[PDB]
Design a protein around this ligand. Sequence first.
Ligand SMILES: O=C([O-])C(=O)[O-]
Ligand SMILES: O=C([O-])C(=O)[O-]
Ligand SMILES: [K+]
Ligand SMILES: [K+]
Ligand SMILES: [Mg+2]
Ligand SMILES: [Mg+2]
Lengths: 522, 519
Amino acid sequence: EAGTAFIQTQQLHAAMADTFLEHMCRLDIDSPPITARNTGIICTIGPASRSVETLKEMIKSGMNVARLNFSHGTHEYHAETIKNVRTATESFASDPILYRPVAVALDTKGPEIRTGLIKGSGTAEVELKKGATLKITLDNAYMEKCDENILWLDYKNICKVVEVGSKIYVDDGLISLQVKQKGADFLVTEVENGGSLGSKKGVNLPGAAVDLPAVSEKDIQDLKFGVEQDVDMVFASFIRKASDVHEVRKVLGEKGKNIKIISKIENHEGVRRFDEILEASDGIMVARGDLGIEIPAEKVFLAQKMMIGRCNRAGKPVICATQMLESMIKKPRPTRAEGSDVANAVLDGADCIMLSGETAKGDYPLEAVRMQHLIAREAEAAIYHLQLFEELRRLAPITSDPTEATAVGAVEASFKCCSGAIIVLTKSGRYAHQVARYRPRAPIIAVTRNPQTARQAHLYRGIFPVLCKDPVQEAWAEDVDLRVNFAMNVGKARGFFKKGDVVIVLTGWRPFTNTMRVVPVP
Amino acid sequence: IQTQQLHAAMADTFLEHMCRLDIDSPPITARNTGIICTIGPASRSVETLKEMIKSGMNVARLNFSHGTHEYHAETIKNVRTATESFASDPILYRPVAVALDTKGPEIRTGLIKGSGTAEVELKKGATLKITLDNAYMEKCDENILWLDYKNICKVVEVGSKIYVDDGLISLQVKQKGADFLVTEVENGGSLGSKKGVNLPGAAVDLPAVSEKDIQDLKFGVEQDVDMVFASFIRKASDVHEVRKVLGEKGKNIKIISKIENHEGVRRFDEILEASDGIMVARGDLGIEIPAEKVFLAQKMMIGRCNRAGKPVICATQMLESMIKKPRPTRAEGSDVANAVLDGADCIMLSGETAKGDYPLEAVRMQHLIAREAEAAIYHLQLFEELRRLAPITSDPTEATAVGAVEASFKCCSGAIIVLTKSGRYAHQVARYRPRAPIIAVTRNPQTARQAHLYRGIFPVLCKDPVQEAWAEDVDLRVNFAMNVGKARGFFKKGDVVIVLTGWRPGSGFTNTMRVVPVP
Ligand SMILES: O=C([O-])C(=O)[O-]
Ligand SMILES: O=C([O-])C(=O)[O-]
Ligand SMILES: [K+]
Ligand SMILES: [K+]
Ligand SMILES: [Mg+2]
Ligand SMILES: [Mg+2]
């Protein structure tokens, strides 16, 4: 009864524009997005978020992956976090229609450089003043006696790799020092950018060839623990070259062979060697915290868009990480730059976006999760699928693989009929991954009986995993019908589609494979 | 390998364009995006302003939400002293524009009662009474909060939401009175003095141009400001009111309409038609509408301004953490880059330069990021689409401008040099968004300052007397641009530059294009 003033939902007017410029001109704050949200949300768990009750609310707010940061905390601490994540996750298991799989990710310490404890209790801070002198020492007598005159750090070969004139950054790159004099086991520096220095802060040596192992002996101990704890994926810090990825993967052994290996790119060499790292990895994290200290801050966006582009081209998951909503550690709503950053990461093509301090330590963890969910959904509607889908195909090789032809045909069909979902029956995840790489607008409901598949599927844009708990039916067609009906019930319950809407169904392995059907929702 | 992201520039798809972006491909020296800096206590001294200019500031913004006319006159005096301290070298001198940002139909709280804590703690669930009784205008505390919107009770009802201080504090109306509201704290926090208030659910009925705004705009005319940033523009008739106040004496002052509420977004096209340009004023906008929708409004407005060839400014919290820290967050570095990639003519700093501890670092970071992002633009697609969407016309000047931009791509020119009295001839080149900088030579000092509103226009103020022969005077001005470009490192001998000049004496056509090896 309103009239022609009706506004197309999910930016459909912008979607039909013949140019990218006119696409932008048509973006409409009054065009509401669809219910489905395709970008995975990864949350770092810490003191602010590790209670079972908070974790339940984080799952409800949209958390898909729990990130454990092994730069901090002992093994018992992480074991208890994992236990709590699973308690919270399985509290929803009585209703398989609404249960959300939640993945567990181990983020390695890796070749970090860290300072010591400020003298006193270690909880105090000292003020470093611009122009003052600061001695860096390796003598362990000072490892708990750091102050404004002497700073201990844990990198035993630092004096070899730096030179007079080199810059040293401390604490998220906020403190900067210039090396004035070198010593046998010390450096004499002058404070350039001063500030308040606390304990055990990260140190970066841009332009220095740091020779710490990609995976140290202690890192291996963490990875072994991760296999014991049945984690789903490893985020490997400071990956510099393909062989670093192999050091992570091979040490997990046969028992850990299905754990996904995500290489974190956070230094100049990792960017330079990106193609060989990507080839060896299951996926990539754009780890912008260290990256933006190791290279100039003004170049990070180039590295981010390069890596997201190349991961999209290869069909491998890419995560955009660090400081996306940083002010929400202390404030209940984000800055305008932060809202923009999350939206542009999704428009760039990131499969997942991440929260670190915002959920690990901050005062508003749920609000931060909720805001990533809201922004992601708005940005997903704004993607110019007409160009993106055309380019993904053209940059995708002709192969004789029938399963790739099925996947692109399914996504093509999904665009042609504006389907409410692509339902995919998958054991390993592969069939759903193949669909996700062509970036449909519609959500991909991936039905699996494999619990690890259901958890790992969150690495891909658009894959909404659902874990089927029913016994296998002896008749294959009846087993397919059961799993398809499950996905139909999930989509109706979640508001992705309604009775009578059109969806695409990919029925997975048949004892041809992965038949496609385009059907109305029953 | 190749500089200036030229490998990415040759990609056949946008996806491959992204894949080819190279942190080891260094940009050109020239920086095309204008930098607007809000001046305040951190940046008001002549000594600091000199460094701001050296660091890349093109426009000084004066925020008339605060301060007296005496105060702002002294700020403007200091800006001009700093700017003219470089005039002894006319080849390196940079014009610096002055922008008056109006208070507009702002809502603000009063002063916190000065006898207690400087801020009061508002706690979730607590009662807070909003009063209009000016007895409390300097006695605000956790029990009673005065604000200056005297008609607020008419436009809210029970249940309305009220946001305070960058929308971080929120209240819900519970009852109403003759001159007061009873509210409950929804989101609490620490409340200081004179904080901005938003009523996103309400039709605020304050005048587009208040009596105070009239005084401020007339003062801007008297002070010879270059442009007005008009706050809270909701509709074309608001722009008309501003232009009427500026009147005949102020007729050449540029009006930039600030879009910061839902109505301004809805009525954007008619606002854009009447305005000289647009500010995406994201602070208020992100409170008036859901924070997750601001990027849609931003890219819509930048796109439509690019389509119209009118300047668009991206503003507010771009480098916000640099108020307190010497380096920005990763989201902030991304935000500045993406504003440039979106197509913003200018980017802006507010608290980062007005009040913060690191104003020079913030200016320098905007310069660095903008230049990197300018190289990463996919000009192949942008130029094709700008051409396809431009209005149809047989105008010789427009055809020469497009020809010059295409020529500049074909030879990777070091600059496009254009001569202009009032700015338009340079504006016409900028709207097709060449990669090369546009060195706009003018003898008009106001044109030189106003040109900063456009992406890529590097104004140079020629101070030589007019030569007797028209052709010699053209050559003098072109040679001035050539020497400026050489001195600034934009090009050197063996490079090629595009030169646009007028047809002949008495013609208004800029219809002559020369492709000049740099001598
Ligand atoms: O390690 C990280 O996540 C980073 O540095 O961004
Ligand atoms: O007024 C402004 O600049 C804003 O609100 O962003
Ligand atoms: K880590
Ligand atoms: K203002
Ligand atoms: Mg890191
Ligand atoms: Mg405002």
